[PDB]
Amino acid sequence: MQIYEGKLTAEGLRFGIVASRFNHALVDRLVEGAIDCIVRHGGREEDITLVRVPGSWEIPVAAGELARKEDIDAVIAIGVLIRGATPHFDYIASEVSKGLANLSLELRKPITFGVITADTLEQAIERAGTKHGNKGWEAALSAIEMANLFKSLR
Amino acid sequence: MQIYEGKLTAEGLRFGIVASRFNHALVDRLVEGAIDCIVRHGGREEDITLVRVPGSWEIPVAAGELARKEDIDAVIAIGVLIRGATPHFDYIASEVSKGLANLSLELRKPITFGVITADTLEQAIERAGTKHGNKGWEAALSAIEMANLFKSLR
Amino acid sequence: MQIYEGKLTAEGLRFGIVASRFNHALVDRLVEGAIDCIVRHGGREEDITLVRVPGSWEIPVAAGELARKEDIDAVIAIGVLIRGATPHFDYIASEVSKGLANLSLELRKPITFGVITADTLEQAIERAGTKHGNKGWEAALSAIEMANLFKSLR
Amino acid sequence: MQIYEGKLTAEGLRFGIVASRFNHALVDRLVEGAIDCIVRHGGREEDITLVRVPGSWEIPVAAGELARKEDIDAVIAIGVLIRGATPHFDYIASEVSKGLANLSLELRKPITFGVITADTLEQAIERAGTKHGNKGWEAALSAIEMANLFKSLR
Amino acid sequence: MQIYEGKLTAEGLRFGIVASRFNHALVDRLVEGAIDCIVRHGGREEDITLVRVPGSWEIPVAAGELARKEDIDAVIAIGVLIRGATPHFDYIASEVSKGLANLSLELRKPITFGVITADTLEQAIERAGTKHGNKGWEAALSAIEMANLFKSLR
Amino acid sequence: MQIYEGKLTAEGLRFGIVASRFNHALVDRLVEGAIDCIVRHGGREEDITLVRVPGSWEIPVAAGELARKEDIDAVIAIGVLIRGATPHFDYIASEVSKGLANLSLELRKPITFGVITADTLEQAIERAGTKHGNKGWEAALSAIEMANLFKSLR
Amino acid sequence: MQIYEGKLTAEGLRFGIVASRFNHALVDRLVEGAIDCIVRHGGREEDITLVRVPGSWEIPVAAGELARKEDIDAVIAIGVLIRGATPHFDYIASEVSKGLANLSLELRKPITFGVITADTLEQAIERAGTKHGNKGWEAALSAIEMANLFKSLR
Ligand SMILES: O=C(O)CCc1nc2c(=O)[nH]c(=O)nc-2n(C[C@H](O)[C@H](O)[C@H](O)CO)c1O
Ligand SMILES: O=C(O)CCc1nc2c(=O)[nH]c(=O)nc-2n(C[C@H](O)[C@H](O)[C@H](O)CO)c1O
Ligand SMILES: O=C(O)CCc1nc2c(=O)[nH]c(=O)nc-2n(C[C@H](O)[C@H](O)[C@H](O)CO)c1O
Numbered sequence A, B, C, D, E, F, G: 001m002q003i004y005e006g007k008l009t010a011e012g013l014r015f016g017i018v019a020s021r022f023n024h025a026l027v028d029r030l031v032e033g034a035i036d037c038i039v040r041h042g043g044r045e046e047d048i049t050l051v052r053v054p055g056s057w058e059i060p061v062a063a064g065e066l067a068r069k070e071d072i073d074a075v076i077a078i079g080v081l082i083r084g085a086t087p088h089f090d091y092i093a094s095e096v097s098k099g100l101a102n103l104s105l106e107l108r109k110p111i112t113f114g115v116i117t118a119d120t121l122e123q124a125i126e127r128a129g130t131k132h133g134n135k136g137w138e139a140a141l142s143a144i145e146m147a148n149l150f151k152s153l154r
């Protein structure tokens, strides 16, 4: 059987992070987590490109530019959506997720999903460096794995 | 670390706004907000192109023409959807959001989302220049930021 | 500020209407409304092309052929979906709306939405020439406006 | 009448399996089922290529690379999604399913769906080698059939 | 400020794992997770020493022998306790935790805690490779970090 | 990977059993079970040393003397605690468990836990040779395994 | 370890099917499933012998004659029992199952159980080619496996 997998050592890997500003008090913890994950797995901070955008809505178009860079191995999308009173959350969460996934397939490059989609503020806090971990760290670890996988698969 | 971000000064930037006429008593406040945000951030009103369309459904096709203009740096979509008795709202909100996001990615140009998607009239009023701000102003500010970001990122 | 908008006079405009047969007792009222709107706004009935299809499912593929005609300025989609006992309604409504919107963007030509998506028969009747107007007339009026807009915008 | 169908003998067929690691205690049972199905229907284990990825989110991009291999007849996607507290499940499940289906159509190659999408842990266990069978085995059997079908249809 | 921390690359590190057999259907998933975490972080499987013992009660005495080995950098304790009808669970969980912690301090060597202490079988399953991750993987990662930390701190 | 484990053949192994007299009608069944387990796994009854003590409180001090014997490979602690009206049970159970575990670590010799800690008489009966097995037999089997393990590990 | 198992390719295998007529509208679907399973796994339809009998009661005596044929490798029993108002169902289901199992052991030949034993008509429909699969297909697949197994085991 031929088996392909990615290790979790990040030496030499180069990452793009796109991070929105809405709910920044939480997003900033996700960004801290993603960078820490990369660095302590052996990636160099210098090899990270961070792009800031206003909201989750704007993440895909920026991620599309980063993922097109030949010197970026994977893109990590970071944001925090918390349901409000209206269905706005639904439409943004749907389009952010669809856009990122579509871009990944179009560009044949891993784009990982570190966007919290929470019904409540409590759920978002839980996932931004408290009881349920740090979604930024999770999405970064995924990106490390996928970038290494792609070194043999792509 | 390489860091890219957009400032909020709008000198020299050129914006397209596509604004629907359905629920105009609310949309017109969103348009006022977007224009004010551009102008007081340093953008010239002469550098704004405003396109009116009948309803939210029609926003994407018009935005597609504006976004294709080489002299437009970002497009701001402005509309107001309020849920009625039938699921019509769902289908329009889904397609307007999907279309705009898809166009942004296809054209590699920022298109911001100033479309209210409210369950009630009260929620729409709240977001069109009253207690929960002005979604037109928010979408304009996002567009300023994204246009500035793209000056280095694109 | 540059301002683009469409007037509501339809002199010289040429329209395609795609109308499904399912629920025809209602769809036929929508078609009457669309034609009346065009004619009394100055459009010639001879400049209308009407295509009939079995159900809402089949509207997009027919609309795609009409919208590709260089001598059609806009397409008006007309149908009536009424929720039944199963989720079938959801999947048809989702695809008819997605298809039309996608075609509009792909062909850079206005395609308006005169498809009722009702939970009940009563709601459909309300929107097919009774208390809540006539969705065919609304979609036709939109098409008039968009065709005029596109005369300067496209 | 011309009739095309796929037999279930897997002699000479070559398969790609993409299996995520999230919920591995269940996914690993699905992988065991898929491999067993192939082998006991006559396929050689040496003709299987297994790609591991972090989560269901990452399955499509990896499946896209495998499906593009001329010496892969079909791809089997294997993962386990279990609903949590937030709507995150919905967005991942929607994009994994959409991506795989889109890739299948784009590449004109069968990609089968062995991804459990469960509301509860119990439901996932039921479908990963207990009372409701093994979704990996089902997706592999489907892939066998489709690969054979395509030998005359493609 | 002097700052000491451990990276997550496991090259050259040597680990002891002590894993009980009670509830093995769950423990065995924790062992899989720990080994995977070591290997994909760069540790060699040949540098792992695995000791099996009957129950959680027996973990400390075995861990004491492994931790005393000069060529073991950290020990990972792996077990699954599920509360029964009597308070037995309390006394075992208390003593296994106390013993491991005491040994770590006595021997000035990291000993990490991969012992699930669940009120229910469902909670144990959740933590042994399903919705709440894999406690073996978590304890292994901790051990990697602590072994690296100790390379400068000890 | 280096793997250490204990087999369940007891040829040549020498055991100490410390058994309390309180609740003897149950403890005596546990002692029967422990002896049977040893003998039918190949241990000689002559190689068992049995020490009787008044209550569970007194088990540790006796176990400490037995575990210090160079010709004892493992000690099996056997007793029955049943909750009464006062918290006395808690303090005895806590100390008997802590003492045994501490002695095991101090003397680097396996001491297994065959002490029932029951809330009710029914629970104790269940665990002393009826529906939930025989805790003496379990603790003896553990001791066999640990003594064998220690033949290579210690 | 010596391991014996049956593959699922049916080339050269010869099968007997005994199918009752009571509840034929469902049994006939089970028979379709059994034949399809055999044929698409490589068995020849000419190598199938189908015996029809009145009711489940009569399946064993007919299966006894088929299983005694040296040129039959396995027998598949197919029927549908649905509980009525009286305990009649219980006695028939008990004897059909006992008879078939007894005959299998007596003749040292696989006889598989494709007899639905349902409390309700809905449950029977579910298992005769709808949501819970096709019991005829399942029993045929079992027979394939057992016939192959017996080629080395018998
Ligand atoms: O309309 C609002 O501002 C409240 C709803 C909202 N919620 C969030 C959220 O929870 N998380 C988030 O990242 N972004 C959000 N955006 C902003 C949009 O993403 C977008 O920036 C604007 O609509 C302008 O395009 C939102 O508009
Ligand atoms: O059918 C109706 O008119 C009521 C539902 C409705 N609601 C809204 C709304 O709340 N906001 C909005 O901007 N537009 C709407 N359009 C119109 C469609 O957008 C479209 O103009 C027509 O269907 C014609 O294409 C609507 O049709
Ligand atoms: O955010 C979480 O980690 C909990 C939700 C979650 N649940 C599942 C699940 O049930 N099954 C699964 O296969 N994957 C999951 N991923 C991970 C994503 O798929 C993805 O790996 C990450 O978002 C990083 O891209 C998840 O993020």
Ligand SMILES: O=C(O)CCc1nc2c(=O)[nH]c(=O)nc-2n(C[C@H](O)[C@H](O)[C@H](O)CO)c1O
Residues within 6 Å of the ligand: D111, D112, D113, D114, D135, D138, D139, D142
């Ligand atoms: O997981 C299951 O098998 C039960 C759910 C299910 N239900 C249906 C159904 O009701 N109708 C249907 O036509 N197919 C189904 N498929 C199978 C999938 O379509 C597909 O074949 C498999 O996921 C393998 O790719 C299903 O998987």
Ligand SMILES: O=C(O)CCc1nc2c(=O)[nH]c(=O)nc-2n(C[C@H](O)[C@H](O)[C@H](O)CO)c1O
Residues within 6 Å of the ligand: E020, E022, E023, E054, E055, E056, E057, E058, E079, E080, E081, E082, E083, E084, E088, E089, E092, F111, F112, F113, F114, F135, F138, F139, F142
């Ligand atoms: O008495 C019982 O066997 C049931 C309670 C029990 N539960 C667990 C458990 O949930 N997990 C576990 O790892 N071990 C257990 N041990 C066994 C003890 O740990 C020990 O092996 C015996 O008491 C013999 O020393 C247990 O005795």
Ligand SMILES: O=C(O)CCc1nc2c(=O)[nH]c(=O)nc-2n(C[C@H](O)[C@H](O)[C@H](O)CO)c1O
Residues within 6 Å of the ligand: E111, E112, E113, E114, E135, E138, E139, E142
């Ligand atoms: O098992 C879990 O991860 C959830 C419970 C838990 N909760 C916390 C917590 O709330 N705070 C905290 O500081 N640590 C925790 N650790 C981790 C352990 O401390 C330890 O790191 C691991 O068990 C590995 O040794 C935990 O394991």
Ligand SMILES: O=C(O)CCc1nc2c(=O)[nH]c(=O)nc-2n(C[C@H](O)[C@H](O)[C@H](O)CO)c1O
Residues within 6 Å of the ligand: G020, G022, G023, G054, G055, G056, G057, G058, G079, G080, G081, G082, G083, G084, G088, G089, G092
């Ligand atoms: O007595 C009745 O006819 C109703 C009960 C009944 N139910 C079933 C059934 O649900 N399925 C089935 O296969 N057969 C049945 N037979 C008939 C007996 O099997 C038998 O044919 C007669 O008793 C005559 O021997 C039954 O008699």
Ligand SMILES: O=C(O)CCc1nc2c(=O)[nH]c(=O)nc-2n(C[C@H](O)[C@H](O)[C@H](O)CO)c1O
Residues within 6 Å of the ligand: G111, G112, G113, G114, G135, G138, G139, G142
């Ligand atoms: O009809 C079904 O498949 C569901 C019921 C069922 N449940 C089990 C089960 O829980 N465990 C099990 O080992 N087998 C089962 N078999 C299959 C039969 O044993 C037999 O294989 C078939 O009836 C074919 O002969 C079953 O048919």
